Amino acid sequence: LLVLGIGISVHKTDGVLRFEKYCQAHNLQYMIVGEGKKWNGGNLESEAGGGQKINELLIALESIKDNKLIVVCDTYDLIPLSGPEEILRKYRFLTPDNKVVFSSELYCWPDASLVERYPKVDTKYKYLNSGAFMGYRDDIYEMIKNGVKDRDDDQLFFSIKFIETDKIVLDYKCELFQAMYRCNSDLVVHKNRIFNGYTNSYPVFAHGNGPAKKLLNHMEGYFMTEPIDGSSNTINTFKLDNEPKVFFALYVDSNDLSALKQFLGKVASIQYGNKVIYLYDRSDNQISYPNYHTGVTKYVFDDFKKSDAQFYFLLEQNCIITKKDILHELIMQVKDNHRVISPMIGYEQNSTRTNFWGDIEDGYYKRSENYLDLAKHKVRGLWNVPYVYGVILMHESVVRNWDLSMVKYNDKDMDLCFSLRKHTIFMYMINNNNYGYMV
Ligand SMILES: O=c1ccn([C@@H]2O[C@H](COP(=O)(O)OP(=O)(O)O)[C@@H](O)[C@H]2O)c(=O)[nH]1
Ligand SMILES: [Mn+2]
């Protein structure tokens, strides 16, 4: 068995890094198709496309000469939750005649007229989703061998193949694949898996297709790729052996002189040797802070890019850090798909108002099911969330390679988070300790 995940990008997203980590945890051999190449498959958000996925898959298949079983899948919004033995057993059971199995889903798209051409079935999971499929290398090769246009629609291509041929079967019972979109009430997390209570199955591949990225990101916080080490926090005093260089980017407003002094005093007490400090002041109105810049109304990345710093540590004036070893603690969490980390702090006079959002609806705050549990530390860890504010540690691989300056909301903190979401760079809130408060 080989898993061919489509990851066409010059630099890796957190989606692909997460997919790789889940593949490794489940002993799945995999190739990232299209790694290092520029995406030309279209703006999938506002328009369909994805033909380039087919063309890159075809090139990859030229390296795989034997007729082996292959899974072909999305990577940005998809993870495996089990290993090759379960996959092979399910495949054999689903298709004794070794057909290509595609994911099912709730909706018939992009061509509504196909509704009446699909086989009639006694399930809501009626239609093809082209985001995950499995079959023999030669069968898949035969379907795609003439290539397509980069901007052709791969969803439509495979829908037509299903309807018109006998080469494809759909995974109606969600055994191998789960298209999660609008199936929230079917699904629970149990024993490190998704359980679909509608189908009575444990789907191997969890696909947060469309807006269900939010749901998969949510469930991620409850899954494991390795056991918790319960002793990681037993001493809450963290010290790095060798300190990477951290660029402190302080967003200040000297108009509020007393708030500024108090903030700078706390920042000066963060224990870290290898650093450079820049002050970015909103006011137009300094001996202790040579790198001082005035009239700044946006987040600034160019000074960091020109530096040799390994991390960018964004701190806003209204966030008061009290945990002196916090930078050591945060850096220890930066690995794999965990590259943007924000410690959870609450407002001093009502700690349920924090510096993250658990959910988002049309770009605005929505209360997630576990929001209050995180804010009150009923459960702790790292959580993939749509917005973080005020204290953000970002690895250089993010800041040096991605446009963090995209504009939607005309608000610096909201637009930074929009930028990251758009690039499939994840924001992780961490609430393992008491870090501070907001004013
Ligand atoms: O720059 C890009 C954009 C997308 N994709 C791949 O195309 C898939 C389809 O996009 P998406 O999952 O967002 O589509 P959806 O499942 O929401 O229709 C992604 O998961 C990736 O595997 C890629 O490789 N590079
Ligand atoms: Mn997808």
SS3 label, residue 304: helix
Residue 4, φ and ψ in degrees, nearest 5:
-105, 100
Q: How far apart are the first and last CA of the chain?
A: 54
| Cα torsion 287, 293, 297, 298: sign | negative
The count of C-alpha atoms lying within 13 angstroms of the C-alpha of 32, restricted to the half-sphere facing its C-beta, is 21
Ligand 1 center from residue 433 Cα (angstroms): 35
- Owner of token pair 């498959």: 41
C-beta 39 within 6 A of ligand 1: yes
DSSP β-bridge partners for residue 364: 361
Q: How many CB atoms lie within 10 A of CB 255?
A: 12
- Is there a contact between 88 and 106 (Cβ–Cβ < 8 Å)? no
Helix, strand and coil in the chain, % to nearest 5: 25, 30, 45
Query: Pairing relation of β-strands 100-105 and 78-80?
Result: unpaired
- Say if ligand 1 is within 6 A of residue 56 CB: no
Q: How far is CA 178 from CA 89, 209, 395, in A?
A: 17, 9, 32
CA distance 434 to 415: 27
Residues 90, 135: Cα–Cα separation, whole Å: 12
Work out the number of other CB atoms within 10 angstroms of the CB of residue 221.
17
Q: Do domains 2-220 and 246-438 have the same CATH topology?
A: yes
Cβ atoms of 226 and 290 within 8 Å: the answer is no
- Looking only at the bridges linking them, the beta strands covering 100-105 and 127-136 are antiparallel
Annotated domain spans of the chain: 2-220, 246-438
In the chain, residues preceding a discontinuity (C to N beyond 2.5 A) are: 285
- What lies within 8 Å, CB to CB, of 41 at 6+ separation is 8, 49, 50, 51, 52, 53, 150, 151
Q: Sort residue 289 into left (φ over 0), alpha (ψ -120 to 50) or beta.
A: beta
Q: Label the pairing between strands 246-252 and 311-316.
A: parallel
Residue whose structure tokens are 């489940």: 26
What class, spelled out in words, does domain 2-220 have in CATH? alpha beta
Pick the atom of ligand 1 nearest to 73's CA: 22
Q: Report the nearest atom of ligand 1 relative to the CA of 210.
A: 17
> What is the bridge-based pairing of β-strands 319-321 and 187-190?
unpaired
CB 274 within 8 A of CB 245: yes
In DSSP notation, 347-404 reads: ETTEEEEESEESEEETTEEE--TTHHHHHTTSS-SEEEESEE-SEEEEEHHHHTTS--
CB of 131 shorter than 6 A to ligand 1: yes
Smallest-distance ligand from the CA of 13: 1
Q: CA–CA separation, 70 vs 101, rounded Å?
A: 11
Beta-carbon contacts of residue 122 (< 8 Å; ≥ 6 apart): none
Q: Which ligand is in closest contact with the Cα of 50? A: 1
Report the distance separating Cα 17 and Cα 31, nearest Å. 12
- β pairing state of 275-281 and 292-293: parallel
Method of determination is X-ray
Give the CA radius of gyration of the chain.
24
The answer to whether residues 52 and 5 touch, using CB atoms and an 8 Å cutoff, is no
CA pair distance 387, 95, nearest whole angstrom: 43
CA distance 391 to 437: 11
Q: Give the ligand 1 atom nearest the CA of 7.
A: 24
CB 401 within 8 A of CB 11: yes
User: How far does residue 215's CA lie from ligand 2's centre (Å)?
Assistant: 13
Q: For domain 246-438, is the CATH number 3.90.550.10?
A: yes
Contacts 24+ apart (CB under 8 A), 142-148: 143/100, 143/167, 144/54, 144/57, 144/58, 144/61, 145/58, 147/54, 147/55, 147/58, 148/51, 148/54, 148/55
CB under 5 Å of ion ligand 2: residues = 74, 77, 131, 209
CB 346 near ligand 1, within 6 Å: no
Ligand 1, atom 9, lies closest to the CA of: 74
Q: What does 132-147 look like in DSSP terms, one character per residue?
A: EEEEEHHHHHHHHTT-
Task: Report the nearest atom of ligand 1 relative to the CA of 213.
Answer: 17
Give the distance (Å) from ligand 2 centre to CA of residue 414: 24
Pairing of strands 205-207, 193-196: unpaired
Backbone angles phi, psi at 388, to 5 degrees: -135, 160
Would you give the DSSP letter of residue 243? P
Measured between alpha carbons, how far is 275 from 50 in angstroms, rounded to an integer? Answer: 43
Ligand 1 pocket: which of 30, 35, 59, 76 to mutate (most atoms within 8 A of CB): 76
Please state, in angstroms and rounded to a whole number, the distance separating the CA atoms of residues 312 and 247.
5
- The answer to whether the beta carbons of residues 86 and 16 sit under 8 Å apart is no
